[PDB]
Coordinates of C-alpha atoms and ligand atoms in Angstrom, one line a residue:
Chain A
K1 CA -49.0 73.0 -109.6
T2 CA -46.2 74.3 -111.8
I3 CA -46.3 74.2 -115.5
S4 CA -43.3 75.1 -117.7
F5 CA -41.7 74.7 -121.1
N6 CA -38.6 75.8 -122.9
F7 CA -37.7 76.4 -126.6
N8 CA -34.0 76.9 -127.2
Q9 CA -35.0 77.2 -130.8
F10 CA -38.1 76.5 -132.9
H11 CA -38.5 73.5 -135.2
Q12 CA -40.8 73.2 -138.2
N13 CA -44.3 72.2 -137.0
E14 CA -43.8 72.1 -133.3
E15 CA -46.6 70.1 -131.7
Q16 CA -46.5 72.6 -128.8
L17 CA -47.0 75.7 -130.8
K18 CA -50.2 77.0 -132.5
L19 CA -49.3 79.4 -135.4
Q20 CA -51.9 81.7 -136.8
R21 CA -52.1 83.9 -139.9
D22 CA -48.6 84.9 -141.2
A23 CA -46.7 83.3 -138.3
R24 CA -44.2 80.7 -139.5
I25 CA -41.0 78.9 -138.4
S26 CA -38.0 79.4 -140.7
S27 CA -35.4 76.8 -141.6
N28 CA -33.0 78.5 -139.2
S29 CA -35.3 77.6 -136.4
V30 CA -36.6 81.2 -135.7
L31 CA -40.2 82.0 -135.1
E32 CA -41.1 84.7 -137.7
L33 CA -44.3 86.3 -136.5
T34 CA -44.8 88.5 -139.6
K35 CA -44.1 87.9 -143.3
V36 CA -40.6 88.1 -144.7
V37 CA -40.1 87.3 -148.4
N38 CA -36.6 86.5 -149.8
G39 CA -35.1 88.2 -146.8
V40 CA -37.3 91.2 -147.0
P41 CA -40.1 92.0 -144.5
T42 CA -43.5 92.8 -146.1
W43 CA -46.3 95.1 -145.0
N44 CA -49.9 94.2 -144.4
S45 CA -48.8 91.3 -142.2
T46 CA -50.1 89.9 -139.0
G47 CA -49.2 86.7 -137.1
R48 CA -49.5 85.0 -133.7
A49 CA -47.9 82.0 -132.0
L50 CA -49.6 80.5 -128.9
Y51 CA -48.5 77.7 -126.7
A52 CA -50.8 74.9 -127.7
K53 CA -52.0 73.9 -124.2
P54 CA -53.9 76.3 -121.9
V55 CA -52.3 77.5 -118.6
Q56 CA -54.2 78.1 -115.4
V57 CA -53.4 81.5 -114.0
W58 CA -55.9 81.4 -111.2
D59 CA -58.3 79.0 -109.4
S60 CA -61.8 80.1 -108.4
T61 CA -62.0 77.4 -105.8
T62 CA -59.0 78.6 -103.7
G63 CA -59.0 82.2 -105.0
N64 CA -55.2 81.8 -105.6
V65 CA -53.5 83.5 -108.6
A66 CA -50.4 82.1 -110.2
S67 CA -47.0 83.7 -110.3
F68 CA -45.0 83.3 -113.5
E69 CA -41.8 84.1 -115.3
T70 CA -41.2 84.0 -119.0
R71 CA -38.0 84.8 -120.9
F72 CA -37.5 85.2 -124.6
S73 CA -35.3 86.7 -127.2
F74 CA -36.4 88.5 -130.2
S75 CA -35.0 90.5 -133.0
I76 CA -36.5 93.4 -135.0
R77 CA -34.7 94.4 -138.2
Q78 CA -35.9 97.6 -139.8
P79 CA -34.5 97.6 -143.4
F80 CA -36.4 100.8 -144.3
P81 CA -35.6 103.7 -142.0
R82 CA -38.1 106.0 -143.8
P83 CA -40.9 106.9 -143.7
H84 CA -41.5 104.8 -140.6
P85 CA -41.2 101.1 -139.5
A86 CA -44.3 99.4 -138.0
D87 CA -45.8 98.1 -135.9
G88 CA -44.1 96.1 -133.2
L89 CA -44.6 92.8 -131.3
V90 CA -46.2 91.8 -128.0
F91 CA -46.2 89.0 -125.5
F92 CA -49.8 88.4 -124.4
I93 CA -52.1 86.4 -122.3
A94 CA -55.7 86.0 -123.5
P95 CA -58.7 83.6 -123.1
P96 CA -58.3 80.3 -124.9
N97 CA -59.2 79.8 -128.6
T98 CA -59.2 83.5 -129.6
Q99 CA -58.6 84.4 -133.2
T100 CA -56.2 87.0 -134.6
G101 CA -57.5 90.5 -134.1
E102 CA -56.9 93.7 -136.1
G103 CA -53.4 94.2 -137.5
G104 CA -51.4 97.5 -137.6
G105 CA -51.2 99.3 -134.3
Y106 CA -53.4 96.7 -132.7
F107 CA -50.7 94.1 -133.1
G108 CA -53.3 91.4 -133.9
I109 CA -54.6 91.2 -130.3
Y110 CA -57.3 93.8 -130.2
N111 CA -60.6 93.0 -132.0
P112 CA -62.8 96.1 -132.2
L113 CA -65.8 94.0 -133.3
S114 CA -65.6 91.2 -130.7
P115 CA -63.1 92.4 -128.0
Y116 CA -61.7 89.8 -125.6
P117 CA -59.7 90.6 -122.5
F118 CA -56.0 90.4 -122.4
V119 CA -52.8 91.5 -120.6
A120 CA -49.9 92.2 -122.9
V121 CA -46.3 93.6 -122.9
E122 CA -45.7 95.5 -126.1
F123 CA -42.6 96.6 -127.9
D124 CA -44.1 99.4 -130.0
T125 CA -42.3 100.7 -133.0
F126 CA -44.8 103.0 -134.7
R127 CA -46.4 106.1 -133.1
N128 CA -50.2 106.0 -133.3
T129 CA -52.4 108.8 -132.0
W130 CA -52.6 107.1 -128.6
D131 CA -48.8 106.6 -128.3
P132 CA -45.9 108.4 -126.7
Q133 CA -42.5 108.6 -128.4
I134 CA -41.4 105.3 -130.0
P135 CA -39.9 102.8 -129.7
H136 CA -41.3 102.1 -126.3
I137 CA -42.2 99.2 -124.0
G138 CA -45.7 99.2 -122.8
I139 CA -47.9 97.4 -120.4
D140 CA -51.4 96.8 -121.9
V141 CA -54.5 95.7 -120.1
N142 CA -57.6 95.1 -122.4
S143 CA -56.3 97.9 -124.6
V144 CA -53.5 99.1 -126.7
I145 CA -53.4 102.3 -124.8
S146 CA -50.7 101.4 -122.3
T147 CA -51.1 101.9 -118.6
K148 CA -47.3 102.4 -118.3
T149 CA -44.7 103.3 -120.9
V150 CA -41.0 103.6 -121.2
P151 CA -38.9 104.6 -124.2
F152 CA -36.0 102.5 -125.5
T153 CA -33.5 102.6 -128.4
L154 CA -33.8 99.6 -130.7
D155 CA -30.7 97.6 -131.7
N156 CA -31.6 97.3 -135.3
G157 CA -31.2 93.6 -136.3
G158 CA -29.6 92.9 -133.0
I159 CA -30.8 90.5 -130.3
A160 CA -33.0 91.6 -127.4
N161 CA -33.4 89.6 -124.2
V162 CA -36.6 90.0 -122.3
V163 CA -37.6 88.9 -118.8
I164 CA -41.2 89.2 -117.7
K165 CA -42.1 88.3 -114.2
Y166 CA -45.4 88.4 -112.4
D167 CA -45.5 88.2 -108.6
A168 CA -49.1 87.2 -107.5
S169 CA -48.5 88.3 -103.9
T170 CA -47.7 91.9 -104.9
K171 CA -49.5 91.9 -108.2
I172 CA -46.4 93.4 -109.7
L173 CA -45.7 92.7 -113.4
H174 CA -42.2 93.8 -114.1
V175 CA -40.4 93.5 -117.5
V176 CA -36.8 93.9 -118.3
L177 CA -35.4 94.5 -121.7
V178 CA -31.7 94.1 -122.5
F179 CA -29.8 94.6 -125.7
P180 CA -26.5 92.7 -124.9
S181 CA -24.6 94.1 -127.9
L182 CA -25.2 97.6 -126.6
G183 CA -25.2 96.8 -122.9
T184 CA -28.4 98.8 -122.5
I185 CA -31.0 98.0 -119.9
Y186 CA -34.6 99.1 -119.8
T187 CA -37.1 98.4 -117.0
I188 CA -40.8 98.9 -116.4
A189 CA -43.3 97.7 -113.9
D190 CA -46.9 98.1 -113.0
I191 CA -49.6 96.6 -110.8
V192 CA -52.0 94.3 -112.6
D193 CA -54.6 92.0 -111.0
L194 CA -54.9 89.1 -113.4
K195 CA -57.8 87.7 -111.4
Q196 CA -59.9 90.8 -112.3
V197 CA -59.0 90.8 -116.0
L198 CA -58.6 87.2 -117.2
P199 CA -60.5 83.9 -116.9
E200 CA -59.0 81.0 -114.9
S201 CA -57.4 79.4 -118.0
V202 CA -55.6 81.3 -120.8
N203 CA -53.3 81.0 -123.7
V204 CA -49.8 82.6 -123.7
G205 CA -48.0 83.7 -126.8
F206 CA -46.7 86.4 -129.1
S207 CA -48.3 88.5 -131.8
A208 CA -46.9 91.1 -134.2
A209 CA -48.0 93.2 -137.2
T210 CA -46.5 95.3 -139.9
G211 CA -47.7 98.4 -141.6
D212 CA -51.4 98.6 -142.4
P213 CA -52.3 99.2 -146.1
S214 CA -54.5 102.1 -145.1
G215 CA -51.3 104.1 -144.5
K216 CA -50.3 103.4 -148.1
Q217 CA -46.7 102.9 -147.1
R218 CA -45.1 99.6 -148.1
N219 CA -41.9 100.7 -146.2
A220 CA -43.9 100.6 -143.0
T221 CA -42.5 97.2 -142.0
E222 CA -39.8 95.3 -140.1
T223 CA -39.2 91.7 -138.9
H224 CA -40.6 90.3 -135.7
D225 CA -38.5 87.2 -134.9
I226 CA -38.6 85.2 -131.7
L227 CA -35.4 83.3 -131.2
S228 CA -36.2 81.4 -128.0
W229 CA -38.8 81.2 -125.3
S230 CA -39.1 79.7 -121.8
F231 CA -42.2 79.8 -119.6
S232 CA -42.8 78.8 -116.0
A233 CA -46.1 79.3 -114.1
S234 CA -46.7 78.4 -110.4
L235 CA -50.2 78.0 -108.8
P236 CA -50.2 77.1 -105.1
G237 CA -53.5 75.4 -105.6
Chain B
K1 CA -37.0 119.8 -108.2
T2 CA -34.6 117.0 -109.1
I3 CA -31.2 116.1 -107.7
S4 CA -28.7 114.2 -109.9
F5 CA -25.1 113.0 -109.9
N6 CA -22.9 110.7 -111.8
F7 CA -19.6 109.0 -111.0
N8 CA -18.1 107.5 -114.1
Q9 CA -15.0 106.8 -112.0
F10 CA -13.8 107.5 -108.5
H11 CA -10.9 110.0 -107.9
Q12 CA -8.8 109.6 -104.8
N13 CA -9.8 112.2 -102.2
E14 CA -13.3 112.3 -103.6
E15 CA -14.9 115.5 -102.3
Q16 CA -18.5 114.4 -102.9
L17 CA -18.2 111.2 -101.0
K18 CA -18.1 110.3 -97.3
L19 CA -16.1 107.1 -96.9
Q20 CA -16.4 105.3 -93.6
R21 CA -14.4 102.6 -91.9
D22 CA -12.5 100.3 -94.3
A23 CA -14.0 102.0 -97.4
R24 CA -11.4 103.5 -99.7
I25 CA -10.6 104.3 -103.3
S26 CA -7.9 102.5 -105.1
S27 CA -5.4 103.8 -107.6
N28 CA -7.4 102.2 -110.4
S29 CA -10.1 104.5 -109.3
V30 CA -12.4 101.7 -108.0
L31 CA -14.4 102.1 -104.8
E32 CA -13.3 99.2 -102.5
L33 CA -15.9 99.0 -99.8
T34 CA -14.0 96.4 -97.8
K35 CA -10.3 95.8 -97.1
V36 CA -8.1 94.3 -99.7
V37 CA -4.3 94.1 -99.2
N38 CA -1.7 93.2 -101.8
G39 CA -4.6 92.0 -103.9
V40 CA -6.1 89.8 -101.2
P41 CA -9.5 90.5 -99.5
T42 CA -9.3 90.3 -95.7
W43 CA -11.9 89.2 -93.2
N44 CA -13.3 91.3 -90.3
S45 CA -13.8 94.2 -92.6
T46 CA -16.7 96.7 -92.9
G47 CA -17.0 99.9 -95.0
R48 CA -19.5 102.3 -96.4
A49 CA -19.6 105.1 -99.0
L50 CA -22.3 107.8 -98.9
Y51 CA -23.0 110.6 -101.3
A52 CA -21.8 113.6 -99.3
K53 CA -25.0 115.7 -99.7
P54 CA -28.4 114.6 -98.4
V55 CA -31.2 113.9 -100.9
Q56 CA -34.9 114.7 -100.3
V57 CA -37.1 111.7 -101.0
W58 CA -40.3 113.3 -99.8
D59 CA -41.8 116.6 -98.7
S60 CA -44.1 116.9 -95.7
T61 CA -45.6 120.1 -97.1
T62 CA -47.0 118.6 -100.3
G63 CA -47.0 114.9 -99.2
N64 CA -45.2 114.1 -102.5
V65 CA -42.6 111.3 -102.6
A66 CA -39.7 111.2 -105.1
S67 CA -39.2 108.8 -107.9
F68 CA -35.6 107.8 -108.5
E69 CA -33.3 105.6 -110.5
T70 CA -29.8 104.6 -109.7
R71 CA -27.4 102.5 -111.7
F72 CA -24.0 101.1 -110.7
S73 CA -21.5 98.4 -111.5
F74 CA -19.8 96.2 -108.9
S75 CA -17.5 93.3 -108.8
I76 CA -17.2 90.6 -106.2
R77 CA -14.2 88.4 -106.4
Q78 CA -14.2 85.3 -104.2
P79 CA -10.6 84.0 -104.0
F80 CA -11.4 81.4 -101.5
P81 CA -14.2 79.1 -102.5
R82 CA -14.1 76.9 -99.3
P83 CA -15.5 77.2 -96.7
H84 CA -17.8 80.1 -97.5
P85 CA -17.3 83.6 -98.9
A86 CA -19.0 86.5 -96.9
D87 CA -20.9 88.6 -96.5
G88 CA -22.1 90.7 -99.5
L89 CA -22.8 94.4 -100.3
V90 CA -25.9 96.6 -100.3
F91 CA -27.1 99.8 -101.8
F92 CA -29.0 101.7 -99.1
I93 CA -31.0 104.7 -98.1
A94 CA -30.9 105.8 -94.5
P95 CA -31.3 109.0 -92.3
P96 CA -28.5 111.5 -92.6
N97 CA -25.3 111.3 -90.4
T98 CA -25.6 107.6 -89.4
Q99 CA -22.6 105.6 -88.4
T100 CA -21.5 102.2 -89.7
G101 CA -23.5 99.5 -88.0
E102 CA -22.6 95.9 -87.3
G103 CA -20.5 94.0 -89.8
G104 CA -20.9 90.4 -90.9
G105 CA -24.4 89.5 -92.1
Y106 CA -25.6 93.0 -91.1
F107 CA -23.5 94.5 -93.9
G108 CA -22.7 97.5 -91.7
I109 CA -26.2 99.0 -92.0
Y110 CA -28.0 97.4 -89.1
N111 CA -27.2 98.6 -85.6
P112 CA -28.7 96.3 -83.0
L113 CA -27.8 98.7 -80.2
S114 CA -29.2 101.9 -81.7
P115 CA -31.2 100.9 -84.9
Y116 CA -32.1 103.5 -87.5
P117 CA -34.6 103.0 -90.4
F118 CA -33.4 102.1 -93.9
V119 CA -34.4 100.7 -97.2
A120 CA -31.7 98.6 -98.9
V121 CA -31.1 96.3 -101.8
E122 CA -28.7 93.5 -100.9
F123 CA -26.5 91.2 -102.8
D124 CA -26.1 88.5 -100.2
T125 CA -23.3 85.9 -100.4
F126 CA -23.3 84.2 -97.0
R127 CA -26.2 82.2 -95.7
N128 CA -27.2 83.3 -92.2
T129 CA -29.9 81.6 -90.2
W130 CA -32.5 84.1 -91.6
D131 CA -31.4 83.6 -95.2
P132 CA -32.6 81.5 -98.1
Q133 CA -30.0 79.9 -100.4
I134 CA -27.2 82.2 -101.5
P135 CA -26.2 84.2 -103.4
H136 CA -29.4 86.1 -103.6
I137 CA -30.7 89.6 -104.2
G138 CA -32.9 90.9 -101.4
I139 CA -35.1 93.9 -100.7
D140 CA -34.6 95.0 -97.1
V141 CA -36.8 97.4 -95.1
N142 CA -35.5 98.2 -91.6
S143 CA -34.1 94.8 -91.4
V144 CA -31.7 92.3 -92.9
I145 CA -34.5 89.8 -93.1
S146 CA -35.6 90.5 -96.7
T147 CA -39.2 91.1 -97.7
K148 CA -38.5 89.5 -101.1
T149 CA -35.6 87.4 -102.3
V150 CA -34.3 85.9 -105.6
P151 CA -31.3 83.7 -106.1
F152 CA -28.6 84.4 -108.6
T153 CA -25.3 82.9 -109.7
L154 CA -22.3 85.2 -109.2
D155 CA -19.8 85.9 -112.0
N156 CA -16.7 85.5 -109.8
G157 CA -14.5 88.5 -110.4
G158 CA -16.8 89.5 -113.3
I159 CA -18.6 92.8 -113.7
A160 CA -22.2 93.2 -112.6
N161 CA -24.6 95.9 -113.8
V162 CA -27.4 97.0 -111.5
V163 CA -30.4 99.1 -112.2
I164 CA -32.6 100.1 -109.3
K165 CA -35.7 102.2 -110.0
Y166 CA -38.4 103.5 -107.7
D167 CA -41.7 104.7 -109.0
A168 CA -43.5 106.8 -106.4
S169 CA -46.9 106.6 -108.1
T170 CA -47.0 102.8 -107.8
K171 CA -44.6 102.5 -104.8
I172 CA -42.7 99.8 -106.8
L173 CA -39.0 99.3 -106.2
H174 CA -37.6 97.1 -108.9
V175 CA -34.1 96.0 -109.3
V176 CA -32.3 94.4 -112.2
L177 CA -29.1 92.6 -112.0
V178 CA -27.1 91.7 -115.2
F179 CA -23.8 89.9 -115.6
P180 CA -22.9 90.9 -119.2
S181 CA -20.1 88.3 -119.5
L182 CA -22.7 85.5 -118.9
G183 CA -25.7 87.3 -120.4
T184 CA -27.7 86.4 -117.3
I185 CA -30.5 88.6 -116.1
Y186 CA -32.1 88.6 -112.6
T187 CA -35.1 90.7 -111.6
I188 CA -36.9 91.4 -108.4
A189 CA -39.5 93.9 -107.3
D190 CA -41.6 94.8 -104.3
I191 CA -43.9 97.5 -102.9
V192 CA -42.2 99.9 -100.5
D193 CA -43.7 103.1 -99.1
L194 CA -40.6 105.3 -98.5
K195 CA -42.8 107.9 -96.8
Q196 CA -43.7 105.4 -94.1
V197 CA -40.1 104.3 -93.5
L198 CA -37.7 107.2 -94.0
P199 CA -37.4 110.8 -93.0
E200 CA -37.8 113.6 -95.7
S201 CA -34.0 113.8 -96.2
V202 CA -31.6 110.8 -96.5
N203 CA -28.2 109.7 -97.5
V204 CA -27.7 107.2 -100.3
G205 CA -24.8 104.9 -100.6
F206 CA -23.2 101.5 -100.4
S207 CA -22.1 99.2 -97.5
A208 CA -20.4 95.9 -97.4
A209 CA -18.8 93.5 -95.0
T210 CA -16.5 90.4 -94.9
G211 CA -16.5 87.5 -92.6
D212 CA -17.0 88.2 -88.9
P213 CA -14.2 86.9 -86.6
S214 CA -16.7 85.1 -84.4
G215 CA -17.0 82.6 -87.3
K216 CA -13.3 81.8 -86.9
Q217 CA -12.8 81.6 -90.7
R218 CA -10.3 83.9 -92.3
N219 CA -11.4 82.6 -95.7
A220 CA -14.9 84.1 -95.2
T221 CA -14.1 87.0 -97.4
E222 CA -14.3 88.5 -100.9
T223 CA -14.0 91.9 -102.5
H224 CA -16.8 94.4 -102.8
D225 CA -15.8 96.9 -105.5
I226 CA -18.0 99.6 -107.0
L227 CA -16.8 100.5 -110.5
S228 CA -19.3 103.3 -111.3
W229 CA -22.4 104.9 -110.0
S230 CA -25.1 107.3 -111.2
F231 CA -28.2 108.5 -109.3
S232 CA -31.2 110.6 -110.2
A233 CA -34.2 111.5 -108.2
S234 CA -37.4 113.6 -109.0
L235 CA -39.4 115.3 -106.2
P236 CA -42.2 117.4 -107.8
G237 CA -42.7 120.6 -105.8
Ligands
LIG301 C1 -53.6 92.3 -146.9 O1 -53.8 90.9 -146.8 C2 -55.1 90.4 -147.0 C3 -55.2 89.0 -146.6 O2 -54.2 88.7 -145.7 C4 -55.4 90.6 -148.5 O3 -56.7 90.0 -148.9 C5 -56.6 88.7 -149.3 O4 -56.2 88.7 -150.7 C6 -56.1 87.4 -151.3 C7 -55.7 87.6 -152.8 O5 -56.5 88.5 -153.4 C8 -57.4 86.6 -151.2 O6 -57.2 85.3 -151.6 C9 -57.8 86.5 -149.7 O7 -59.0 85.9 -149.6 C10 -57.9 88.0 -149.2 N1 -58.3 88.0 -147.8 C11 -59.3 88.8 -147.4 C12 -60.7 88.3 -147.4 O8 -59.1 90.0 -147.0 C13 -55.4 92.1 -148.8 O9 -55.5 92.3 -150.3 C14 -56.5 91.7 -151.0 O10 -56.1 91.4 -152.3 C15 -55.9 92.5 -153.1 C16 -55.4 92.0 -154.5 C17 -57.2 93.4 -153.2 O11 -58.2 92.6 -153.9 C18 -57.6 93.8 -151.8 O12 -58.9 94.5 -151.9 C19 -57.8 92.5 -151.0 O13 -58.2 92.9 -149.6 C20 -54.0 92.7 -148.4 N2 -54.1 94.1 -148.5 C21 -53.6 94.7 -149.6 C22 -54.4 95.9 -150.2 O14 -52.5 94.4 -150.2
LIG302 C1 -11.2 93.3 -86.3 O1 -10.7 94.7 -86.4 C2 -10.5 95.3 -85.1 C3 -10.2 96.8 -85.4 O2 -9.1 96.8 -86.4 C4 -9.5 94.6 -84.3 O3 -9.6 95.2 -82.9 C5 -8.8 96.3 -82.5 O4 -9.6 97.4 -82.5 C6 -9.0 98.5 -81.8 C7 -10.0 99.7 -81.8 O5 -9.9 100.4 -80.6 C8 -7.7 98.9 -82.5 O6 -7.0 99.9 -81.7 C9 -6.8 97.7 -82.6 O7 -5.6 98.0 -83.4 C10 -7.5 96.5 -83.3 N1 -6.7 95.3 -83.3 C11 -5.4 95.4 -83.7 C12 -4.3 95.4 -82.7 O8 -5.1 95.3 -84.9 C13 -9.9 93.1 -84.2 O9 -8.9 92.3 -83.5 C14 -10.1 92.5 -85.6 N2 -10.4 91.1 -85.6 C15 -9.4 90.2 -85.5 C16 -9.6 89.0 -84.6 O10 -8.4 90.3 -86.2
LIG303 C1 -53.9 110.2 -137.6 C2 -54.1 108.7 -137.9 O1 -52.9 108.2 -138.3 C3 -52.8 107.5 -139.5 O2 -53.7 106.4 -139.5 C4 -53.7 105.6 -140.8 C5 -54.8 104.6 -140.8 O3 -55.7 104.8 -139.7 C6 -52.3 105.1 -141.0 O4 -52.0 104.2 -139.9 C7 -51.9 102.8 -140.2 O5 -50.8 102.5 -141.0 C8 -49.5 102.7 -140.3 C9 -48.4 102.3 -141.3 O6 -48.5 103.2 -142.4 C10 -49.5 101.8 -139.0 O7 -49.6 100.4 -139.4 C11 -50.7 102.2 -138.1 O8 -50.6 101.4 -137.0 C12 -52.0 102.0 -138.9 O9 -53.1 102.4 -138.1 C13 -51.2 106.2 -141.0 O10 -49.9 105.6 -141.2 C14 -51.3 107.0 -139.7 O11 -50.4 108.1 -139.8
LIG304 C1 -26.1 79.1 -87.3 C2 -25.1 80.1 -86.7 O1 -24.1 80.3 -87.7 C3 -22.8 80.8 -87.4 O2 -23.0 82.1 -86.8 C4 -21.8 82.7 -86.3 C5 -22.1 84.0 -85.6 O3 -23.4 84.0 -85.0 C6 -20.8 82.9 -87.5 O4 -21.4 83.9 -88.4 C7 -20.7 85.1 -88.4 O5 -19.5 84.9 -89.1 C8 -19.6 84.5 -90.5 C9 -18.2 84.4 -91.1 O6 -17.9 83.0 -91.3 C10 -20.4 85.5 -91.3 O7 -19.7 86.7 -91.4 C11 -21.8 85.8 -90.6 O8 -22.5 86.9 -91.3 C12 -21.6 86.2 -89.1 O9 -22.8 86.3 -88.4 C13 -20.6 81.6 -88.2 O10 -19.8 81.8 -89.4 C14 -21.9 80.9 -88.6 O11 -21.7 79.6 -89.2
LIG305 C1 -38.7 103.0 -149.2 O1 -37.5 102.5 -149.0 C2 -36.6 102.5 -150.1 C3 -35.3 101.8 -149.8 O2 -34.7 102.3 -148.6 C4 -36.3 104.0 -150.4 O3 -35.4 104.1 -151.5 C5 -37.6 104.7 -150.7 O4 -37.4 106.1 -150.9 C6 -38.2 106.7 -151.9 O5 -37.8 106.3 -153.2 C7 -36.5 106.7 -153.6 C8 -36.3 106.1 -155.0 C9 -36.4 108.2 -153.6 O6 -37.3 108.8 -154.6 C10 -36.7 108.8 -152.2 O7 -36.7 110.2 -152.2 C11 -38.1 108.2 -151.8 O8 -38.4 108.6 -150.4 C12 -38.6 104.5 -149.6 N1 -39.9 105.0 -150.0 C13 -40.7 105.7 -149.1 C14 -42.1 105.2 -149.0 O9 -40.2 106.6 -148.4
LIG306 C1 -8.7 78.7 -97.3 O1 -8.5 79.0 -98.7 C2 -7.2 78.5 -99.2 C3 -7.1 78.9 -100.6 O2 -8.0 78.1 -101.4 C4 -7.1 76.9 -99.0 O3 -5.8 76.5 -99.3 C5 -7.5 76.5 -97.5 O4 -7.7 75.1 -97.5 C6 -7.5 74.5 -96.2 O5 -6.4 75.0 -95.5 C7 -5.1 74.8 -96.2 C8 -4.0 75.4 -95.4 C9 -4.9 73.3 -96.5 O6 -4.7 72.6 -95.3 C10 -6.1 72.7 -97.2 O7 -6.0 71.3 -97.4 C11 -7.4 73.0 -96.4 O8 -8.5 72.5 -97.1 C12 -8.8 77.2 -97.0 N1 -9.0 77.0 -95.6 C13 -10.2 76.8 -95.2 C14 -10.7 77.9 -94.3 O9 -10.9 75.8 -95.4
CA307 CA1 -48.2 101.8 -132.1
CA308 CA1 -26.3 86.8 -95.1
MN309 MN1 -47.7 101.9 -127.6
MN310 MN1 -30.0 87.8 -97.2

């Protein structure tokens, strides 16, 4: 049992994608998670994009958990250097049919009022109280307070290549971030037991958010574009 | 305490390096692990390059194991496509003062007669009986029969960037292989307890080998050049 899909680009109204909130697909075929007006990213924005069909990460009958690999490219343009860009984007796995959570530093995946479990890889650009220096890659399990963190220098407006791989046998989740224009490579990994955190079926996708109004800083924003995305999951039973 | 060294280039008569067997440094300052004459790689060649000073990966007094990160660039040119290039190169950690092992598929790190422990990351180009398709990256522990394997397409003559990171707290060894000219990224990781496999002090370096004469194939060869190499390790206490 191996499921998989590929998006070399995104078309308007893909029957395979479920867009929520501010998420939208541009004319250029790019998935814009957060609002961008007349070429300018806006604040107080939150958006998600989930693969329409649910994927089975583990089977309770056999006890087997799936191994998977996903690759995508994104771009984050920060037009306004000061006071501070925000907030970042994440790739996440969550139960089916969840609704966008809180924006801001919660990226739209954490819902303080009705929390749902999730595993996510974040590309954090704003330093909240619970954060280390930014930008940083983080591995999140049921919380925005990362288990592991690693700093990286953003290629403003440049393209970033990401590879996330999960090996069920070792329970290792390793992510690689590469900025081809700079030739920089960033790596991070951690042990995560998906069977202990998530239900048998889940949704996979992205979520991002720009500055929250409470910070009263309209400049706290940036773009969160996904240029391409491939996903492959393998369940031995 | 934390050891650290960097080789942005290799200078002939490199004081901080122990070259063994066919390993030598060209005029262009590249580390040629295996024999190349008049611009042509030869068979029946084996060579290693070790950092002259030993590094302490763990301390028996505190029980602490070191975390480390090493980055290097290599190039493998395969002049003769048919019948089959061989054999590949590896980055390895072994006890101090070891001597080049068997060539061929053993890369010069495995000594059937008098075996010594070692952890190595291989870039295998020839398919031996114990191998999956080639080329492939492999994680080796005391043996050339990899614990984990992942296939990759070689950029013939191109430059390859490698990042190997070891996190003592999680015991995760993750390696990233990138071919900038192709934009391809390959990743692999596994759990390895260095404290259970290696002595407190070790040597770090590279080793490679070309086709073994027993195969009666002079075309079973390729180059194994190391363009640059940086290493950093942190042993707390
Ligand atoms: C941030 O976005 C919110 C929605 O994404 C804004 O609220 C929405 O405002 C629309 C126009 O007023 C209204 O049609 C929507 O129903 C409403 N959504 C809800 C229920 O929150 C929010 O600002 C709102 O509108 C301004 C004019 C004020 O009335 C605010 O008090 C509202 O929340 C946006 N935040 C800000 C302050 O820009
Ligand atoms: C592979 O290389 C070895 C070593 O160069 C060749 O065997 C001989 O090894 C002895 C070591 O005591 C040297 O003194 C000889 O000079 C080596 N051969 C010669 C005369 O060059 C071995 O023959 C090589 N394999 C083949 C078939 O070419
Ligand atoms: C010490 C707490 O920090 C401040 O928290 C504020 C609201 O709780 C603001 O943070 C919010 O807005 C910023 C953008 O201005 C980000 O979107 C944060 O993620 C969001 O919580 C303020 O900016 C913080 O300094
Ligand atoms: C299935 C057995 O394969 C053959 O094994 C031979 C020796 O056991 C030869 O392999 C040796 O030489 C080749 C060069 O062509 C490589 O260097 C191998 O690593 C080495 O063991 C023969 O080539 C194999 O087909
Ligand atoms: C938000 O971004 C714009 C565009 O880069 C900046 O010009 C703003 O700077 C602020 O306004 C200008 C006119 C000047 O007074 C400067 O001192 C201010 O900092 C910037 N505004 C914020 C919120 O920093
Ligand atoms: C070894 O590589 C060279 C360079 O590509 C090839 O020319 C050889 O091809 C074979 O041998 C030559 C002499 C010629 O007869 C050709 O028709 C053969 O295919 C190649 N030899 C091997 C080991 O296959
Ligand atoms: Ca944050
Ligand atoms: Ca081999
Ligand atoms: Mn964070
Ligand atoms: Mn192998």
